[PDB]
Amino acid sequence: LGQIYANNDKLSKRLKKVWKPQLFEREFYSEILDKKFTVTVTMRTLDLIDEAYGLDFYILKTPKEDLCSKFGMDLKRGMLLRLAR
Amino acid sequence: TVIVERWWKVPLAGEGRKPRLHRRHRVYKLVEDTKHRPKENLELILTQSVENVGVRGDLVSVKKSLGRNRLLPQGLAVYASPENKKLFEEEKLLRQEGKLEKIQTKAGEATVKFLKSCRLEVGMKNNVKWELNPEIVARHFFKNLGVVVAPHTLKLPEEPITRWGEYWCEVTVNGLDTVRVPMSVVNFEKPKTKRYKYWLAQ
Amino acid sequence: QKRREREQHIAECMAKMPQMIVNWQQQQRENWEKAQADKERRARLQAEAQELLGYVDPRSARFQELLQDLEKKERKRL
Amino acid sequence: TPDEKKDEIEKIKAYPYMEGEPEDDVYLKRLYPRQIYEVEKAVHLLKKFQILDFTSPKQSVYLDLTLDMALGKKKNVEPFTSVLSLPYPFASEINKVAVFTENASEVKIAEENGAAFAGGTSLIQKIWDDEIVADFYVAVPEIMPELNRLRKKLNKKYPKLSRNSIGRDIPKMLELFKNGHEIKVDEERENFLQTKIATLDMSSDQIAANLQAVINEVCRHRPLNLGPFVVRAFLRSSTSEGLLLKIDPLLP
Amino acid sequence: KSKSKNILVRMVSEAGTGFCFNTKRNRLREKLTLLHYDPVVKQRVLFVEKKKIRSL
RNA sequence: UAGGGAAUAGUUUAAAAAACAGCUGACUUUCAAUCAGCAGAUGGAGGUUCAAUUCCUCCUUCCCUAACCA
RNA sequence: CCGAGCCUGGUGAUAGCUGGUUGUCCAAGAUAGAAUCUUAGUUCAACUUUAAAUUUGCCCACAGAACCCUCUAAAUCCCCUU
RNA sequence: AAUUUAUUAAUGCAAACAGUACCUAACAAACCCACAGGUCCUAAACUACCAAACCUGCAUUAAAAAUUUCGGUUGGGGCGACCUCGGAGCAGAACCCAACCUCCGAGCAGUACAUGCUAAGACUUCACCAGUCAAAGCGAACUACUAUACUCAAUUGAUCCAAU
Ligand SMILES: [K+]
Ligand SMILES: [K+]
Ligand SMILES: [K+]
Ligand SMILES: [Mg+2]
Ligand SMILES: [Mg+2]
Ligand SMILES: [Mg+2]
Ligand SMILES: [Mg+2]
Ligand SMILES: [Mg+2]
Ligand SMILES: [Mg+2]
Ligand SMILES: [Mg+2]
Ligand SMILES: [Mg+2]
Ligand SMILES: [Mg+2]
Ligand SMILES: [Mg+2]
Ligand SMILES: [Mg+2]
Ligand SMILES: [Mg+2]
């Protein structure tokens, strides 16, 4: 949620502007939980999962402030509880 | 991802303090939208065989759509992580020297599948007396079927062929798979004549 | 290096200058003698033509063209 | 630089090619790029094919050259015919040349240098009133006014200064033509040049020399270092497929 | 505000010093070559018009 | 102003040609058309080359495209 | 009291516009202009006030300040002395 | 009227998402071959189509709106006219002096190419800004073209900014 100058000229009108992410519904498989989840994601999430070599690594490695998802934090607790027990 | 930057400078806050943001610092300019960037490929290690690439343990660079929507979900491929690379590398050593048997390369599987379902038209000229030998027959794979066959691999029926007829050529692909293709010896027709005669006519 | 190059460029350009002036002075004298030739010839031809026809683009154009042809015909012979 | 012409030049450069047979013994041609290169091996291979595909021992090697005959500047060069005899002219005998010269001593120089057809008005009138066929025509400046009658008949094949076929010295094209072999040009102007090099029985070294001569001959039209003049080279026999030569070393 | 009969042009010294001055010339007349004092070399040098600054 | 491109007979095109106009005529009541003739050109300057519309350079005019803000 | 409701808040809105601006006593104190979306206002000059510095200020004798053109004007400027 | 398209709709591109197809106009002139056809006089090269929507980003065009303004002088305002600069009268003789007073003009042109540099002392449109004249000096010019701050009355535009 921000503002922009029309035609990128500070002397022109200042307009409200919202940039929204492109959302995709994709299916992921968790090895630790042995379950498939249909989750709305962005292309960034897919890239981050690729760099982590899987959903389980992404969920476990990513700190709370980077996941930015209550569902993601719930998956982390589920995975961690299975590993702990 | 949209990447933006502020039009107006934000004053330094210092160590251990939060920046003082005025309402002018909400004015942004679009630096870049990363969805328009040139797409990069995804490096995966194959598990099963696929038409494009099929050697188990082959490091393949695929389109991110292909890897994410097909290979990885179905188990046909795995991530090229350091741990996975080590495991597949170890298996390669065993295949080369150990009990584990050697397997066709990516191209070898493609040829074998084509050689299983193909018939060779070995056009031979009527005027000149001709004897069919591996070298001559090898040439016709290149011209007719488009396969580049090494002369030594071919195994002919071992009966001298000087008459138009039907025989069998046993092709060995890379030394592991032996395919027997139907062989149709026919009177040679030049490319232009054969295409005009039949392809154009019908 | 920059200073040495600029000084060298000026020195070279300024050793040619004396001859350049000689050529320039002659061109001015030549232009003075060409203007006189033009002043004379154009006026006479154009003046006579205008007096006859109309007491003047067509006549001027003709004289301004045939004279060029005469010079070209000499250049063609060369 | 028209998009189609320049884009194709970009595309043809893109076509991949490789050195050496792939590891696989038997491989589908589609699965790997073009491979066979060396000009020596290429000639030897073309002889191999001749034996396998029973055909005449002597055949015309119709080397087709995808020579960048364009893009000197953003303005493109044009197709000409720089005629030069190869070091060993192949056994084909061609002696067809028409010379226009009337009431001039050039009539002698024309025939002295081996002109097939030399004449003036009588020859010009024969061309207009009745059919006659020569491969190439030459005319002195004095006869060009009269020759203008055959401009329409020859459909721009009449002598032109652009092709160096108008001049007091006729032997520019006349003398060298019989031994010389014309570097003709494409009709579609796609830059491919079909120019026979040698008979198949010609020794590899002689054919290799015949190849190098053409390389300099073809660059003659635009021998500038500004724009690369050669892209690909396919040495094909009459009854064989073209082979991609490694011409880069031989270019300069 | 009137018909443009003259133009302003930049005269560049031929000494290589790079000293320049602006002069007014008739639009239809040929490019000016002038002998003008060049302070860098401290003597009169030939100048040649290079560009037209504006229309006068 | 910026670069790109362009300049051919009075006019419009071509690779030094054709078409129209001017037409001088012939023939049509008149006029058009039609036939046959005749004039006619390589923006300007400089240079290369034996020879330059066809190589290059500067200038004029015009177009294109983008400016024309303060 | 709808050319656009009402209430609260921003809010002590802003107003070159009008109105108002609280004890005593004395003193000096009137007015060329310029620019300005400026002529109902401002800023700079000018005038006016206070303090300070050191030196002339005012009034004015001769001599002196244009031809062209009609009223050959009343006067002015400069200016020692006083 | 200026500014604007965030918004809404349409269109294009990207993003996202399937795969599908891979390309044929001889002809012997001579010779061979029982045919069917071949030898010579080329039998090369070359991949092309291509995923409907929704959503997101970037553009373009519309609709529908938003924000803001609507100069001054003026024998009231409007209408007409005027708005900067120079010469003359009013203003007769140092300077200054107004009217929607009376008259005439300017928004250049032409010649130089030292209309190079530098520097006492002055003038000044009643402020400021701006504008004006200049000895000596350096460097030139010069052998007497009323010559070294051109002729000309006005012949003109600050700051920011832009180009270089
Ligand atoms: K009142
Ligand atoms: K006011
Ligand atoms: K009144
Ligand atoms: Mg009410
Ligand atoms: Mg108030
Ligand atoms: Mg008092
Ligand atoms: Mg104003
Ligand atoms: Mg006032
Ligand atoms: Mg006194
Ligand atoms: Mg306004
Ligand atoms: Mg008013
Ligand atoms: Mg009034
Ligand atoms: Mg009005
Ligand atoms: Mg003053
Ligand atoms: Mg002096």
Curated annotation (Swiss-Prot), chain A:
Locations listed in the record: Mitochondrion
Membrane-traversing stretches: none
Tissue specificity note: Found in a variety of normal tissues including spleen, testes, thymus, liver, kidney, brain, adrenal, lung and retinal tissue.
Complex formation: Component of the mitochondrial large ribosomal subunit (mt-LSU). Mature mammalian 55S mitochondrial ribosomes consist of a small (28S) and a large (39S) subunit. The 28S small subunit contains a 12S ribosomal RNA (12S mt-rRNA) and 30 different proteins. The 39S large subunit contains a 16S rRNA (16S mt-rRNA), a copy of mitochondrial valine transfer RNA (mt-tRNA(Val)), which plays an integral structural role, and 52 different proteins. Interacts with OXA1L.
Family statement: Belongs to the bacterial ribosomal protein bL28 family.
Further remark: Potentially represents an important therapeutic reagent for HLA-A24 patients. This antigen is recognized by tumor-infiltrating lymphocyte (TIL) 1290 in the context of HLA-A24.
Protein name: Large ribosomal subunit protein bL28m
Gene that specifies this protein: MRPL28
Residues of the full protein shown: 87 to 171 of 256
UniProtKB/Swiss-Prot annotation, chain B:
UniProt record similarity statement: Belongs to the bacterial ribosomal protein bL9 family.
The keyword Ribosomal protein appears for this protein: yes
Keyword Phosphoprotein: no
Molecular function, one GO term: RNA binding
Localisation per UniProt entry: Mitochondrion
Complete-protein stretch covered: 53 to 254 of 267
Subunit and partners: Component of the mitochondrial large ribosomal subunit (mt-LSU). Mature mammalian 55S mitochondrial ribosomes consist of a small (28S) and a large (39S) subunit. The 28S small subunit contains a 12S ribosomal RNA (12S mt-rRNA) and 30 different proteins. The 39S large subunit contains a 16S rRNA (16S mt-rRNA), a copy of mitochondrial valine transfer RNA (mt-tRNA(Val)), which plays an integral structural role, and 52 different proteins.
GO CC annotations on file: mitochondrial inner membrane; mitochondrial large ribosomal subunit; mitochondrial ribosome; mitochondrion
Protein name per Swiss-Prot or TrEMBL: Large ribosomal subunit protein bL9m
Keywords: Mitochondrion, Ribonucleoprotein, Ribosomal protein, Transit peptide
Swiss-Prot record, chain C:
Listed GO biological process terms: mitochondrial translation
Induction: Down-regulated by p53/TP53 in apoptotic cells.
Gene Ontology CC, one term: mitochondrion
Coiled-coil ranges from the UniProt annotation: 1-78
Key word Transmembrane present: no
Record bears the keyword Cell cycle: yes
Compartments where located: Mitochondrion; Nucleus
Tissue specificity comment: Widely expressed. Highly expressed in the thyroid gland, heart, lymph nodes, trachea and adrenal tissues. Expressed at lower level in liver skeletal muscle, kidney, pancreas, testis, ovary and stomach. Barely detectable in adrenal adenoma and papillary thyroid cancer.
Keywords: Cell cycle, Coiled coil, Host-virus interaction, Mitochondrion, Nucleus, Ribonucleoprotein, Ribosomal protein
Subunit: Component of the mitochondrial large ribosomal subunit (mt-LSU). Mature mammalian 55S mitochondrial ribosomes consist of a small (28S) and a large (39S) subunit. The 28S small subunit contains a 12S ribosomal RNA (12S mt-rRNA) and 30 different proteins. The 39S large subunit contains a 16S rRNA (16S mt-rRNA), a copy of mitochondrial valine transfer RNA (mt-tRNA(Val)), which plays an integral structural role, and 52 different proteins. Interacts with GADD45A, GADD45B and GADD45G. Interacts with NR4A1 via the NR4A1 AB domain. Interacts with ATAD3A and ATAD3B. (Microbial infection) Interacts with the human papilloma virus type 16 (HPV 16) minor capsid protein L2.
Family membership: Belongs to the mitochondrion-specific ribosomal protein mL64 family.
From Swiss-Prot, chain E:
A GO-annotated cellular component: mitochondrial large ribosomal subunit
Transit peptide as UniProt keyword: yes
Cell compartment(s), UniProt: Mitochondrion
GO-annotated molecular function: structural constituent of ribosome
UniProt keyword list: Mitochondrion, Ribonucleoprotein, Ribosomal protein, Transit peptide
Coiled-coil annotated spans: none
GO annotation, biological process: mitochondrial translation
Assembly with partners or alone: Component of the mitochondrial large ribosomal subunit (mt-LSU). Mature mammalian 55S mitochondrial ribosomes consist of a small (28S) and a large (39S) subunit. The 28S small subunit contains a 12S ribosomal RNA (12S mt-rRNA) and 30 different proteins. The 39S large subunit contains a 16S rRNA (16S mt-rRNA), a copy of mitochondrial valine transfer RNA (mt-tRNA(Val)), which plays an integral structural role, and 52 different proteins.
Record-stated family: Belongs to the bacterial ribosomal protein bL33 family.
Protein name as it appears in the record: Large ribosomal subunit protein bL33m
Originating organism: Homo sapiens (Human)
